[PDB]
Design brief:
This is part of a larger assembly, with two copies of chain A (48 residues). Chain A is largely without helices or strands and 48 residues long. Chain A contains one helix and no strands. Chain A has one helix spanning 39-44. Chains A and B meet through loops of A and strand 2 of B. The PDB classes it as viral protein.
Chain lengths: 48, 48
């Protein structure tokens, strides 16, 4: 109740912090993935 | 009873259809040994 601790010297420290910001932008196509080059499959896909 | 199978092997029994000329570097419909499809045929450096 009557003792304190006071520092007499100091130091300068540099720390690194890495943060993600963005990711890859991906675009898909329903054609040439679901049916490919096939007119018969593409005809049935028009309802979706 | 006709028990027949088809797989990645040379064929022995085929149907009576006449072969045609092959067109390269164009989007054409192809019929190879009964396998039908649509695509572009190019000379290949692959090794079977």
């Amino acid at each position: 109740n009557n003792s304190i601790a006071i520092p007499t010297n100091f130091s300068i420290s540099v720390t690194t912090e890495v943060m993600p910001v963005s990711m890859a932008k991906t675009s898909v196509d329903c054609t040439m993935y679901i049916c490919g080059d096939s007119l018969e499959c593409s005809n049935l896909l028009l309802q979706y | 009873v006709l028990s027949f199978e088809l797989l990645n092997a040379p064929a022995t029994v085929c149907g009576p259809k006449l072969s045609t000329q092959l067109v390269k570097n164009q989007c054409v419909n192809f019929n190879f040994n009964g396998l039908k499809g649509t695509g572009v045929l190019t000379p290949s450096l692959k090794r079977f």
